[PDB]
Structures are given as C-alpha cells and as structure tokens.
C-alpha cells in the first residue's frame, strides 16, 4: 500500500459524499389525501340508496353488523 | 438511485394499499328481482284477454308456435 491510493480513495469518498437530496414530503401529503377521498366517496351511493328506497335517516350507520329491511 | 426515493415509493405503495371496499351484493340481488317481475308481469294482460274473449284455460301456453282461433 502507498499514500497515492489512500489519498485518491479519501478524495473519491468526499466526492461521492456530495449528492443532493430534494424534498419528499408533499408527495406523501398528497397521496394521503388522494386515498382518503377515494375511500370515503363511495358511501354516497349507499346514502342515496337508503334515502330513496324508503327507510329514514339516523338508522344509517357504519360497521359490520349485517343488514335487514329497516336499518342499513 | 438512492434509498430515500425507494423508501418513499415503498411507503406510498403501502399507503395506497389501504382503500376500503364496501358491500356490493344487495345491489345485484335487488336488480335481479326488479327485472324478474318486470319481465313476468305483462303476461297478465294476455291471460285476462284469453279468459275474457271466449277460449277456456289450459290451452294457454308459452313459447313461439304461432296462434289460431282456439289456442293462445
């Protein structure tokens, strides 16, 4: 081993240790909103169906408790 | 390529892989019944016509075998 190789390696290390990094927060901030609406939009179909069929409001809830001929 | 971009992509993939899916069986179950009755209701007109014209029952059948002055 010599000093030339070691110095060249040290210089190349510092050279590589200079890559810039741009922002990456707005991407996730927008992806979260693009998914929230896509997930909570389809409920309007069920709401309109329940309001136009015959049953009144209030009884319309969320979860997984089966269904019947009165509550949705 | 760096690790920041890859990790952000992996995180956005998992974020997108979270959209909920509501039920979609009652819609078809109701559409089938809404079509069955709509298809098999009009036969009452022909039944009443055949019973009020003069010909008796029994001879009233279904299919596509033409018609005459006795059978419907």
């Amino acid at each position: 081993f010599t000093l030339i190789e070691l110095m060249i390696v040290v210089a190349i290390i510092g050279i590589l240790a200079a890559i810039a990094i741009p922002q990456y927060q707005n991407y996730v901030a927008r992806s979260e909103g693009a998914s929230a609406l896509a997930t909570i939009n389809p409920l309007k179909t069920t709401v309109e169906e329940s309001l136009s069929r015959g049953i009144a409001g209030s009884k319309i809830k969320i979860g997984t408790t089966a269904s019947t001929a009165t509550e949705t």
Side-chain angles (χ1 to χ4, degrees), chain A:
Chain A
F1 222 69
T2 182
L3 184 65
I4 301 292
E5 189 111 335
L6 189 54
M7 207 55 46
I8 292 282
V9 163
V10 167
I12 296 156
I13 287 282
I15 285 157
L16 288 175
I19 295 156
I21 286 154
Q23 189 167 13
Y24 287 119
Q25 192 172 78
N26 291 354
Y27 297 121
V28 182
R30 204 168 294 141
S31 81
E32 286 180 339
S35 75
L37 187 66
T39 300
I40 62 121
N41 190 64
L43 306 184
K44 284 187 280 90
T45 61
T46 297
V47 164
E48 285 276 29
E49 197 199 12
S50 52
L51 287 175
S52 61
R53 198 167 69 206
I55 65 184
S58 89
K59 295 181 167 78
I60 299 160
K61 303 168 180 177
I62 40 73
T64 313
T65 56
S67 187
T68 175
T70 308
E71 311 180 37
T72 291

